[model samples]
Target: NWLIKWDDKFQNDTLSISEFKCSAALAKLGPDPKHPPTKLGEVLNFPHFVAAPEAQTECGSCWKLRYKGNHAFVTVVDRVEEANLFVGGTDLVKNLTTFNGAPEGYDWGTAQLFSAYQVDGSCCQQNTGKQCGDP
Candidate 1:
């Protein structure tokens, strides 16, 4: 009798990858302002994540984790902090699995959907040694 294995057979090359670009627009809030600033705690919202729906090229074994989705969300917030950019970049490979609960070979997109919300900061600066912590 012949048996089939339910293992990942896709090659890395079969996946697609995209690069992230910086925004050309100037920051609405500058260090020095010509006009008087508004009151503290006032609603001051800004746009973030210039690139939405960044596509993940390769499907790694790590993406199949139970908590993968949540982890990715935390990572997105962390990346925004680290790069000092309003948006998360496409380079999610650098900070994967920085936390304890993170599964091996996972991406931020997957983690964000499933992992719990945590702290936000540079991956190196997080108290848990990860960019983001549990909610």
Candidate 2:
């Protein structure tokens, strides 16, 4: 794990992943969705990935992010601000269980977590110790 200063505090929240289910919305966000960054392995257009700025700039790399008992494996495929945060789509938010129980077309929720680890698998109860990338 690595440390990143965010909102004036240092926490291991430098990297993150996100996704978007709407292609039309992505079209206006700049950069042709059809021509996304070519640094990804499994990315055809929209994938469960994040735009890693300076805090996390390893494109196509994977990381295991957690929020409460939920977690997911996110990939880096683009770039954003240098802040230690994740920004992209909603799939990552759903996988992390960070989405509030808002009705469709309702308000979107937000999460402020600091714990993270760069691993191959998502966090779960089945695996522990080294299998989850712990010593």
Candidate 3:
């Protein structure tokens, strides 16, 4: 686990995560952004298998919680129809699960998804204390 600056600030009140499932409406807002997209691995680093899909920088989608110290971006890199579940660099539909000014979607779990250790079958039930890098 990352030794994060988790502020129990008197109780939980924030959250975050990666992957994508952007809607057409969300993608249009981020037309050809110069900001390079993020990959599922860049943020997690080891623990999850490295693959082509994991390398793509399209992590603006998905999440169900908010944290004070946890940081992630919510700018669209593409867009797709709401009926579609896939986000292309074109729509980021398949690549996104959340967007700005909107509710974060999909819950891809924590260390489990990012842990290469999980490819061997493991999880965040423990594996704690590594300092996190800037996202």
Candidate 4:
């Protein structure tokens, strides 16, 4: 789970702002309330899954780096002292396309993958710019 904090320093009435707690957000994901909270220890006790990287094609969306799945993967990997998660849309495409059929060339999963891979950019790595580096 993750939380969204509103920075009063950047407050603007024209822009809707609110704080979101991750646990609360997860609650809306359809988990049964009777189930115990997913503990970090429990997660650490599980086996790691190795996922292949996908290639990135052009598509515009920045929220992928902030998605919950990527966030959790990074958090877990960071805490476990494992490999640093890499973010790239190509890998995202592979994962999504594998499950969802032919790729649309872009989707939220791409953003989520890029977020996980920690690749810095809105485009593929080959593009040259300040955004084409490490996150």
Top model number, lDDT: 2
Between 2 and 3, whose TM-score is larger? 2
Give the per-residue lDDT digits (tens) of candidate 4, residues 65-119.
3332232222111111113332322333334334336443234333223233334
Query: What would the TM-scores of all predictions be?
Result: 0.20, 0.47, 0.15, 0.17
Off by over 4 Å in 4: 1-21, 28-30, 39-93, 97-135
The lDDT values for all models are 0.22, 0.41, 0.22, 0.25
User: Candidate 1 lDDT, tens digit per residue, 15-83?
Assistant: 111221211111111122333213211101111112221232111001211222323321221111222
Q: How well does candidate 1 score on lDDT at residue 55?
A: 31
* C-alpha RMSD for every candidate: 15.5, 11.6, 17.8, 17.3
Stretches off by above 4 angstroms in model 2 are 1-46, 99-109, 120-135
The CA lDDT at 114 in model 3 is 16
Best model per TM-score: 2
What lDDT does candidate 3 reach at residue 110? Answer: 16
Ranking according to lDDT, highest score first = 2, 4, 3, 1
Which stretch of 10 consecutive residues in model 2 shows the poorest summed lDDT?
3-12
What local lDDT does model 1 show for residue 125?
A: 28
Query: How far off is residue 55 in model 3, in Å?
Result: 28
User: Using alpha carbons, what is the TM-score of model 1?
Assistant: 0.20
Q: What's the ranking of the predictions by TM-score, best on top?
A: 2, 1, 4, 3
- Candidate 2 local lDDT, 1-135, one digit each (tens): 322211101111232223322222223222334543222222422345554564454554456666666555655545556565655445555555444553221123345444655554222221223354541
Candidate 4's C-alpha lDDT?
A: 0.25
